[PDB]
């Protein structure tokens, strides 16, 4: 009579040192993993519940304009720099990482009706109610010098 | 955001490469661990060159 039995060699299945991590053999026989359809339905339902719990969209609010905001322009080269224009006539440059205002300029009298950035990113253009088109330099004025178009 | 940084030290000059980073939310309590934790820092920053004095 010839016979072998199912005898797992323990060294193949037990880790060797405490620094080692446990071994995990995997078997994908469907008999071992039943109820696949009801099971995944529960997992999907849990995921939708957690998505509603963790939905927190508001991040920050930036303050400093003294009249309502009217224009927005993003910087082509930098993610964290944005430009805004208010109805009183001021233009403000913001740092998104720091959530503060970098510069303030009295660009126009009346509203500012539009603002656009040159594709290189070293200048931007603005339009106001004083029937004027002005070109500014993206870099801030040096020292205490008043900023000039 | 792939860019190179030059770092000066008393021992020498170091040139490093940055792979990716969350720029806008970098100074936020959970995202800031990208630079604070050494394991996360290694994933996004590499040392490409070094010249000792």
């Amino acid at each position: 009579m010839k016979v072998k039995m199912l005898s797992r060699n323990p060294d193949n299945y037990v880790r060797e040192t405490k620094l080692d991590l446990q071994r995990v053999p995997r078997n994908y026989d469907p008999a071992l993993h039943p109820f696949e359809v009801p099971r995944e339905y529960i997992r999907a339902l849990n995921a939708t519940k957690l998505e509603r719990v963790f939905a927190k969209p508001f991040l920050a609010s930036l303050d400093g304009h003294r009249d309502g905001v009217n224009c927005l322009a993003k910087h082509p080269e930098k993610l964290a720099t944005v430009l805004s224009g208010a109805c009183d006539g001021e233009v403000r440059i913001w740092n998104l990482t720091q959530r503060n205002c970098i510069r303030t300029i009295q660009a126009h009298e009346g509203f500012v009706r539009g603002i656009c950035t040159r594709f290189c990113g070293t200048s931007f253009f603005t339009v106001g109610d004083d029937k004027t088109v002005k070109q500014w330099k993206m870099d801030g004025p040096g020292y205490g010098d008043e900023e000039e178009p | 955001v792939l860019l190179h940084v030059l770092f000066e030290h008393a021992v020498g000059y170091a040139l490093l490469a940055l792979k990716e980073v969350e720029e806008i939310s970098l100074l936020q309590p959970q995202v800031e661990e990208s630079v604070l934790n050494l394991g996360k820092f290694h994933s996004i920053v590499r040392l490409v060159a070094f010249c000792p004095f």
Binding site: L79 | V1, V21, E23
Partner: peptide
């Protein structure tokens, strides 16, 4: 990629 600016499609 988290920090990279995405530009519009260009002919290529």
């Amino acid at each position: 990629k988290p920090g990279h600016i995405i530009n519009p499609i260009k002919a290529e």
